[PDB]
């Protein structure tokens, strides 16, 4: 049951796994990239806030970080502060299997967008994955800038 709007935030809480990562600036999502983070779980703080738990590599070690995200005026949109100011929203989700996030980072230097595909399990059908790829292309993210994380160290060995 795909959902493209009016999302039940409580039903996207819990564990997620970071499968595909995309950006119009590839350095942001390659190794050592400011945006190469691996989601661990999403939880509802309040009627209007979220807390993301994610892993990043710090001196070679998987390291847990927390990010507070607040709902904004536009529906489904959130904002967060990681290497600049970020606005993100759900593109679509199947609550039990996958979710697609679009993020926009606005900074002094150079504005850029992010696309992320999470799964309830460390992978999803290639049907879901290429719907994601077509999304990225429609948003003019080059296919060269889409990274499959299923075959990289995404800190799964550190989720607890």
Neighbours of 119 (CB within 10 A): 22
Q: Locate 48 and state its tokens.
A: 């209007």
d(CA 12, CA 154): 20
Fold of the domain spanning 1-160? Lipocalin (2.40.128)
d(CA 88, CA 77): 6
Among left, alpha and beta (phi > 0; psi -120 to 50; other), residue 60 is left
Residue found by looking up tokens 């800038």 in the block: 145
3-state secondary structure the chain: CCECCCCCHHHHCEECEEEEEEECCHHHCCCCCCCCCEEEEEEECCCCEEEEEEEEEECCEEEEEEEEEEECCCCCEEEECCCCEEEEEEEEEECCCEEEEEEEEECCCCCEEEEEEEECCCCCCHHHHHHHHHHHHHCCCCHHHEEECCCCCCCHHHCC
**Could you tell me the CA-to-CA distances from 37 to 17, 121, 138 in Å, in that order?**
11, 17, 24
The domain segmentation of the chain, as residue ranges, is 1-160
CA 120, distance to chain mean position in Å, is 13
Q: In angstroms, what is the resolution? A: 2.1
Closest CA to 55 of 155, 147, 150: 155
Torsion angle of the four alpha carbons 53, 54, 59, 61, in this order, in degrees rounded to the nearest 10: 90
Instruction: Tell me the torsion sign for CA atoms 131, 137, 143, 146.
Output: negative
């Amino acid at each position: 049951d795909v959902v493209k709007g009016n999302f039940d935030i409580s039903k996207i809480s819990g564990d997620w796994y970071s499968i595909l990562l995309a950006s119009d600036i590839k350095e942001k999502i390659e190794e050592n990239g400011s945006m190469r983070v691996f989601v661990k779980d999403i939880e509802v703080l309040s009627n209007s806030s979220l807390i993301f738990t994610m892993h990043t590599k710090v001196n070679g070690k998987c390291t847990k970080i927390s990010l507070i995200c607040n709902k904004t005026e536009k529906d489904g949109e959130y904002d967060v502060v990681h290497d600049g100011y970020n606005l993100f929203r759900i593109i679509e989700t199947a609550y039990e299997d996958y979710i697609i996030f679009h993020l926009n980072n606005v900074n002094q230097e150079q504005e850029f967008q992010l696309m992320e595909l999470y799964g309830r399990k460390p992978d999803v059908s290639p049907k879901v994955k290429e719907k994601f790829v077509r999304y990225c292309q429609g948003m003019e993210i080059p296919k060269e800038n889409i990274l499959d994380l299923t075959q990289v160290d995404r800190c799964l060995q550190a989720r607890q």
